[PDB]
Paper text:
CP forms the capsid shell that protects genomes and is responsible for both host specificity and receptor binding to transport the viral genome into infected host cells, or for intracellular trafficking. We determine cryo-EM structures of T = 4 and T = 3 capsids of virus-like particles (VLPs) of Lake Sinai virus (LSV) 2 and delta-N48 LSV1, belonging to tetraviruses, at resolutions of 2.3–2.6 Å in various pH environments. Analyses of these capsid structures reveal the intermolecular interactions that drive subunits assembly into homo-trimeric capsomeres and eventually into a complete viral capsid in which specific domains, such as the N-terminal domain, the helical domain, and the β-barrel domain/C-arm, could encapsidate nucleic acids.
To investigate the positions of sequence variations in the context of the VLP, we truncated the extra N-terminal 48 residues of LSV1 CP, namely delta-N48 LSV1 CP, which self-assembled in vitro into delta-N48 LSV1 VLP, for cryo-EM structural analysis to inspect the structural differences at the regions of low sequence homology. We reconstructed the density maps of the T = 4 and T = 3 delta-N48 LSV1 VLPs at 4.8 and 3.5 Å resolution, respectively, by gold-standard (0.143) FSC. We could only determine the structure of the T = 3 delta-N48 LSV1 VLP because the densities of several large side chains were apparent and the rotamers could be properly modeled. The cryo-EM structure of the T = 3 delta-N48 LSV1 VLP comprises residues 96−558 of subunits A, B, and C, in which residues 49–95 of NTD with N-ARM and the last residues 559–565 of CTD are disordered. The helical domain of T = 3 delta-N48 LSV1 CP comprises a three-helix fold as found in LSV2 CP, but is equipped with an additional N-terminal distal helix (α1’, residues 96–104) that associates with the core (α1, α11, and α12) of the helical domain. Delta-N48 LSV1 CP interacts with ssRNA via the rigid helix α1’, α1’–α1 loop, β-barrel domain, and C-arm. K545 and R556 are two basic residues on the C-arm, but only the side chain of R556 faces the ssRNA-binding site, as does that of R370. This ssRNA-binding site is formed by the dynamic C-arm and the βF–βG loop of the central β-barrel domain.
Author numbering:
A (entry chain B), B (entry chain C), C (entry chain A): 96 to 558
Amino acid sequence: SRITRRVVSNLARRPLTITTAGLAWLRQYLNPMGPSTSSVSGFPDGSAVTTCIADYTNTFNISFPPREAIYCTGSNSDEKPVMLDAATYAKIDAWTKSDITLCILALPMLRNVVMIRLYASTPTAFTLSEGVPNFVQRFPNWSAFTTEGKVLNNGDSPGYIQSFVYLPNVDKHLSAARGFRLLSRGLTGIYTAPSLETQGFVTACQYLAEGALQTQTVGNDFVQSVEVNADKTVKNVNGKRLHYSGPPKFVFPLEGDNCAPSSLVETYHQAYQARAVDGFYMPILSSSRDNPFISPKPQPIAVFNRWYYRGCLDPVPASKVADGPSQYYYDLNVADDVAPLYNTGVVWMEGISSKFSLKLKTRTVIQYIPTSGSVLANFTRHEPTYDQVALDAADRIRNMMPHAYPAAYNDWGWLGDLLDSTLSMLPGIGTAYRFAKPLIKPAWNWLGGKVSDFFGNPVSRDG
Amino acid sequence: SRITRRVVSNLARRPLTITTAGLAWLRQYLNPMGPSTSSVSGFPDGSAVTTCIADYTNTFNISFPPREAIYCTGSNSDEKPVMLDAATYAKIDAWTKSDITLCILALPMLRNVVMIRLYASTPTAFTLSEGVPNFVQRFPNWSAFTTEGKVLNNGDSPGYIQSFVYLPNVDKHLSAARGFRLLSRGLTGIYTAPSLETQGFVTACQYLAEGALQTQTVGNDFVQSVEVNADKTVKNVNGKRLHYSGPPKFVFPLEGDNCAPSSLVETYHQAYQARAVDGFYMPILSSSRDNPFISPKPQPIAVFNRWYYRGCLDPVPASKVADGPSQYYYDLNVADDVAPLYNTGVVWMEGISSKFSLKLKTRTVIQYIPTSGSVLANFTRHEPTYDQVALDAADRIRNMMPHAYPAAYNDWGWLGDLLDSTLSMLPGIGTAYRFAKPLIKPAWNWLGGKVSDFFGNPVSRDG
Amino acid sequence: SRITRRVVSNLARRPLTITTAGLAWLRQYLNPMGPSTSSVSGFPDGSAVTTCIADYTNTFNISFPPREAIYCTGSNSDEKPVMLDAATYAKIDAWTKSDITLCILALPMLRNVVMIRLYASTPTAFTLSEGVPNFVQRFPNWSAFTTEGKVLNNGDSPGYIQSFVYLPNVDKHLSAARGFRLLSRGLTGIYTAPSLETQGFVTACQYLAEGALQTQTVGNDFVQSVEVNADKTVKNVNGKRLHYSGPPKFVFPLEGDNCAPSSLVETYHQAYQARAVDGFYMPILSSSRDNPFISPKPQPIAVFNRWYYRGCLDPVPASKVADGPSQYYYDLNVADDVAPLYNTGVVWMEGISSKFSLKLKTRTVIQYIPTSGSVLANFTRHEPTYDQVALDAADRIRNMMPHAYPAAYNDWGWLGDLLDSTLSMLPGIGTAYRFAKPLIKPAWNWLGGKVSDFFGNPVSRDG
């Protein structure tokens, strides 16, 4: 479409607009895994500090794991991880006859980029275990769970298996940086199954789940003061119930009943959905205007679900105010330098073939402030830039972008001018005199039929 | 004043300005209980998510409660609320001979919209009980307290009674929503007393009291490790003093000595004051630019007052650093999904007649993100809008608006053009070419005499 | 340079720009200790509330303290501070033969403005004591420490001495104000040593260290429930290990290994460095756009350093998740109404003569909201102003300003027009038509050689 702006470039001019660096950052942020892999650029805020920008590209081959890749998470595996017993693994192998459901939940955690789950059938809700599990395994090692969300011992009935995805280089770099900020993140799953078995539906959506450091009320009723005279007068023990704060932890609000595929596809406008063979490609979008540096702060991660006891909502006695609304936090038994303000993503793939293979790539771009004497200090860069109209454009476009795209759609045609279209009535400029394009309502029918982009031009998808 | 903008509309034009939706939201936000009751509109941020907007209008008839509406809050009422004894109620009835003082404190709590208090005479400070009270009653049930801020048993001397105002529909809806945000809130009290008894002075003011989730240091000195040999050697008990964190709670900073009517009317410019018969109407204004969604998070509410022990401010030994500045948090014995960033309001009415009647209405507009399967899902709406110049105008006008108005003044004449006047030198537009009005310093003498609005036009108040 | 804007004032005009009040605030904020001492102005946000602005100017004569000014911090000084023994003080006096290192760390604390340290030689890292020290002294009283970061008893080997700098008037005023906000802060050290002994290098830098209220996980293993029958059956004691939250405290993230002079001068662009005799002058810059009021909230201050135990990062058993990453918070044994969003400053002076004298002045400007009945109420002021283009300029200029200046450089020539230069392409105005100056890259070679300002004009430094 070169002739378009070849011929319309002589009708209007351009006031103060984005620089090339803010443009480069915005195109590595909206489309992290497109053509922007050639170069990386930092957050345009003029930090005026020595920073080093590191990108991590990782690939994994998710498949139905063999027996040796599974691990019990119950009591029988508390000093070391334990193989899944052959008798127990027979129940897992029973899932091979039918189809399965793959769940990929990407919290804004850096070391553990995503969390993978395999259900025999689509679950009603995204459950969790009450008790903290034992030795949460990382890919390619999995960790089974019971039919309901409880830890599993050998011989119990398994309902789903789980495995995080750990990036060791991110850990090594984060151990040696004063601060960091997640510049961009992108997931991409290319699904492929043996030919003539192509069933399955993929639905992907991202939403802000702003966790924070909180503590859980705990009551234990421990003894307080006992008096003795060398074992002759132990009459008073003075034990009493005490409510205190458990160890602090970073809690993520994500509600169990609402992570089902139907709830997400029906609640969120931009929740992408398509046939499984189309794959998926999710760029994770931030949820805030700014992006301050965070010093590396690792603490255990927990997830909040709906409370159980009404407690203080109704009038209650004085003694039981401490209990209040009994709200329970589930452990993930992992710790990470969580970076909030980024949307939590979630992808469901139901009906996929049992012996599928999901070829998953991930690109994560992080900006560090190195500690001198570390390796990060040898790759530093000191031409920081400031361009806040790019930040305003990022604030603009976050709502209008769809939540995911087909895997093959890693190439766009409407970046360099869509920013101009925003510039047109960007309120920062009273009249930008922009001739790029008038905005058109898009209709992305990714499942089938015609697909309309932001400007009504059909996409050339075929094979 | 139609002819004004009939004749001045031909001298200048208008650049990018507010839409109709941002206008509708701003007029339901500045004046929640005016003519904007016809329709409701959401926060203009382009959330692009399924939301449902619910408005709650409630009316209550505050009066001097009879005997059966009072309840002891001390130890004698710890398994169930207890009637106020007739002997104790005689002291309360003694307040009937003279005038009284009504205090209405509206924290940014959603379920418990306001908290009501009745003093025999204007208190020096807004006190609270040290110990958490028993069965904090809701309207129309009250809960007495001693002369000073201590819980009351039958036979003690009462100083003031208290009753929250609970909205059950808000509780039902909040139990079934992923997130929420308080769009607007407005209180209105129409005072009326028997004719020829019209004395009383009302002073109303709102101010940001930004509470947060904090914990209180608690020391208990509980035993740690005792060794025995079947009751022959209990020589060591090893008890020691330990300082830990109490259960987490949402603390509101509002200082006791500074809630007196004189302090508020003398400290705050816009603190409205008038004769009691004029009634009052307080729109609660937000204190922040944005308004993010909050997942329903109920925790007990506490209030902070001035600390007592200097502690670590002066040089202190190592062992007593944990105590530090002894700062005590008072319970309200209530839990609510508190929504910060909204100003805490407070209204005092001193000298009002004993058998007055305060007809109080409240309008609260909240935007939910429904959980599918709940009732909220059946009333949803998916035309979200974005208009950030309206948000900039809201940021502009917050300082200039007065804190309250007379009850009868629910109709304005300067909304549609005051926003234009802001637009004139809104820095977003270099030259807006606006002809609405030049800003004029207002002087609101609501107690008596002439009252000047934002443009010098007198208000037509008479009877 | 009057002729410059005498002759270039006839070529262009000026749209909406800063007022005189926003200008006055910005010049008391960027250069707190320049000519702006004539008058003080508040934060330009239109708070519309009674405020009183108080400035504190303090002077101190830091020198090598005599014996009576030192105090042990170990166990032998836990009921009262103890003189440093003559035998122990001999080791300190041994530092007189050689040069020394002075460290000045200014956290955004109000009562304790700075913290002073004296090392016999430049330390590898800015360490701290594991155990909380006893009676942290204030100037002119110091408090010794061991060679490594441990508290010192008489007879131990001393490594460095420490003394805070306490402002009592700030404490008195903060005890009687509803809220406050640090308008500006500036340090200035004029070093002077006997003539012919002028060696030493000063390096100064400031950086945001955003502390917050957090708690530390503590495990103690205290007994829970023991049953007896008057000392005949004590068979079960039921003690167990419990992890809870320690007392809440305000934690500052500042990493020990990275406060060395080389790390700061090599990591930060604007980290000022010069010969010691040149002195230093650090204006502390805020790190945020806004500056909300904070109610006086004193709590103990702690500092975070790199964690030790990996903990939950690798797969771990269920029982030991509570421990997680063992991260230890160091006490400073002080409490203050910390005001975050202000950069933590730090100045190192190595090689300075043993019997030097550092004449240190400090100017701190704070805006209070008085509590009526306090002294602050008698000096109040009610002409608040709003000028947000000044705030945008403050946001602009924060990155470009150097972190410190020579002590004698308390006079500038590029304030009134540099703001205009920002105005030129301030995106708020599409075309500001400003003729002040085109921006030029500065090169501050304060150690020696020519120094280039923001416009290339050399500074007239001589003697």
